[PDB]
Amino acid sequence: DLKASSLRALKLMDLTTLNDDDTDEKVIALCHQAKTPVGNTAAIVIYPRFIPIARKTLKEQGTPEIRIATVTNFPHGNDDIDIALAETRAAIAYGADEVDVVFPYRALMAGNEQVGFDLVKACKEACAAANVLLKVIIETGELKDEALIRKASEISIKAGADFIKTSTGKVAVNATPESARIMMEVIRDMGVEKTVGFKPAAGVRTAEDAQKYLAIADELFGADWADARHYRFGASDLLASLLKALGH
C-alpha cells in the first residue's frame, strides 16, 4: 500500500522552498523537481517575489497546471491586518494561485479572538475576488494546547479559510500526527469538509509519515476525500522519499 500512498502524496504535494538564500535559479530548479517522472506535484510554494519567473518556468516545461502558492504575514503571524492584507494583495498581483497566510496566533494566545477572524476575512476577501485560494497557517507547534489549536482552526474556518495548515516550518515544532488529527476533527465537527482542506506542513519527511497522515483523512472523510482541493503536503524534503518508494 506504501507505493500507492506515495504516489497519492506526491500528487498532493505543495513542493516548497522558503529559504533566506533562495534565488531565481533555486526556484527554477524547484519547478523542474515538481515535474517528476511519475507525475506532477499539486503546487509549488515560494516567496512572492519568485512567482513571475516560476510561472514562466512551469509554462515553458509544459506543466502550467502546477499551482503557484506563496506565503504572507509570514512567518511571524503578527496581528497587523493592514500589513497582512497589503502582502496578500501583492502576492495576488505577482500572480499567485494560492496564498498561505499566517494566523495571528500570538494574539489569540494573548486573548484576542477577534483579530484572527478579521485578519483571515480581509485576506480571504482579496483572494476570493482574484479567484485565489486562501490557506491559513495556525502554527500548531506554538499554540501547543489542543483547545487553542481547535479555536484557531474554528476561527479560520468561520472567517473563510479554504485550507487550514498546521505550520510555517519556521518554528521548531511543525506538523505532528496529533495536531493533524485535532484540526481534521474540527473540519469534521463543523461539517465543512466540502469547502475546507487540510495541509500538514514541515513535519512530514518520509513516505511512511505521508501514509500515516493520509490514513487520518481516509478514516475521517472516506478514501475519496483527499484530492488536490482538500489535501496538500507542505514539504521541502519529502519528494525524494516518495520517489524512492516508487522506484525512482
Author numbering: 3 to 250
The authors write:
Deoxyribose-5-phosphate aldolases (DERAs) are acetaldehyde-dependent, Class I aldolases catalysing in nature a reversible aldol reaction between an acetaldehyde donor (C2 compound) and glyceraldehyde-3-phosphate acceptor (C3 compound, C3P) to generate deoxyribose-5-phosphate, DRP (C5 compound). The 3D structures of several DERA enzymes have been solved, and there are also a few complex structures available. These have revealed that despite of relatively low sequence identity, all DERA enzymes have the ubiquitous TIM (α/β)8-barrel fold where the catalytic amino acids as well as other amino acid residues around the active site seem to be relatively well conserved. The DERA reaction proceeds via Schiff base formation between an active site lysine residue (K167 in Ec DERA) and the donor acetaldehyde substrate. The active site of DERA is located in a deep binding cleft, where the donor acetaldehyde binds to the bottom of the cleft and the acceptor glyceraldehyde-3-phosphate to the upper part, near the cleft entrance.
In addition, the crystal structure of one of the best Ec DERA variants, C47V/G204A/S239D, having improved activity towards acetaldehyde and basically no activity on DRP or DR, derived from the 3rd mutagenesis around, was determined from the crystal soaked with DRP. The structure of Ec DERA C47V/G204A/S239D variant was determined from crystals after soaking with DRP. The crystal structure showed a presence of a very small covalent adduct to the catalytic amino acid K167 in both molecules in the asymmetric unit. The electron density map showed elongated electron density corresponding to approximately two carbon atoms. In the refinement, it was modelled as an imine group representing a reaction intermediate. No binding of DRP or glyceraldehyde-3-phosphate could be detected. This could imply that binding of the DRP is clearly diminished in the C47V/G204A/S239D variant. The conformation of the loop containing mutation G204A has pushed the position of its Cα atom by 1.0 Å towards active site, thus narrowing it. Because the residues of this loop participate in phosphate binding (of glyceraldehyde-3-phosphate acceptor), the S239D mutation would probably decrease binding of DRP both by introducing a negatively charged amino acid residue (phosphate being also negatively charged) and by narrowing the active site entrance. On the other hand, the C47V mutation, located relatively close to the catalytic K167 residue (about 5 Å), has caused only minimal alteration in the position of this amino acid residue, as it is located in the middle of β-strand.
